């Protein structure tokens, strides 16, 4: 996260980091055996790790649970990201608490203007390379479709949405895939992709997660 603010240990319960020796990408629990991620963060041998702060140090609030099965959306296009988003299984249940807990899924599209909290352990930086150990947060607002579309030519489906600032200066980067964008306390977007961190005119591009609310409820109805 470029541009953030430290979240405070556990205050984002929802934010989930998905480990395979080392951090390498974030996700939302949605429910106790299932995490949501980007589908670019799709990798084998991922084990899930929740109440996670500092993801050096055991706090004593993290839950480190492997995970059973992993499914990536069905039209998943690598090359232009469309339908980002992918669902991962745990092998066990969490144990919900006050510091791990999930976050429900909407059930309308958020507005543009909408503020939302974007969160997640990657780079801080829009040019050069520093990774923090703590949650990095981010209030940032959905743009609308036009000033989206503007900044990203032809590459903007209606399955995306921006959201940041065309100022620059704030965004999610590079190791913060897969993880929350969150407003009105549901999950509305999946950290996807942006031309670079923090470029001025060219802010992030979110999985539009409303869109995929039938694909998610069927698929944990029948795994
Ligand atoms: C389809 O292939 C692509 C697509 C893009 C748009 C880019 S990019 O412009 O460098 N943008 C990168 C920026 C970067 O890697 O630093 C990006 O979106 N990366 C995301 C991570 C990310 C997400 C959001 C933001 C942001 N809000 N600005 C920045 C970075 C990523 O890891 N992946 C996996 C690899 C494929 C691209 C997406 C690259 C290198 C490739 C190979
Ligand atoms: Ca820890």
Redesign the pocket.
């Known amino acids: 996260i470029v541009g953030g603010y430290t979240c405070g240990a556990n205050t984002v319960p929802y934010q989930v980091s998905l480990n395979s020796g080392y951090h390498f990408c974030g996700g939302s629990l949605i429910n106790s055996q299932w995490v949501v991620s980007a589908a ?1 963060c799709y990798k084998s041998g991922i084990q899930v790790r929740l109440g996670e702060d500092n993801i050096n140090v055991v706090e004593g609030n993290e839950q480190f649970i492997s995970a059973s099965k992993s499914i990536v959306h069905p039209s998943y296009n690598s ?1 232009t ?1 469309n339908n980002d988003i992918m669902l991962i299984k745990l092998k066990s249940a969490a144990s919900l608490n006050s510091r791990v807990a999930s976050i429900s899924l909407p059930t309308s599209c958020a507005s543009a203007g909408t503020q939302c909290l974007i969160s997640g352990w990657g780079n801080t930086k829009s040019s050069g390379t520093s990774y923090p150990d703590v949650l990095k947060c981010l209030k940032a607002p959905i743009l609308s479709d036009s000033s989206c579309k503007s900044a990203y030519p032809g590459q903007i489906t209606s399955n995306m949405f921006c959201a940041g600032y065309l100022e620059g200066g704030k ?4 190791g ?2 897969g993880g929350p964008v969150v407003c009105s306390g549901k999950l509305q977007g999946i ?7 923090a470029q001025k005119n060219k802010p ?1 591009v979110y999985t539009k997660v409303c869109n995929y609310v039938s694909w998610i409820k069927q698929t944990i109805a029948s795994n």
């Open positions: 670019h090359n990201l965004d999610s980067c590079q913060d895939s950290v996807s992709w942006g031309s670079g961190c992030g």
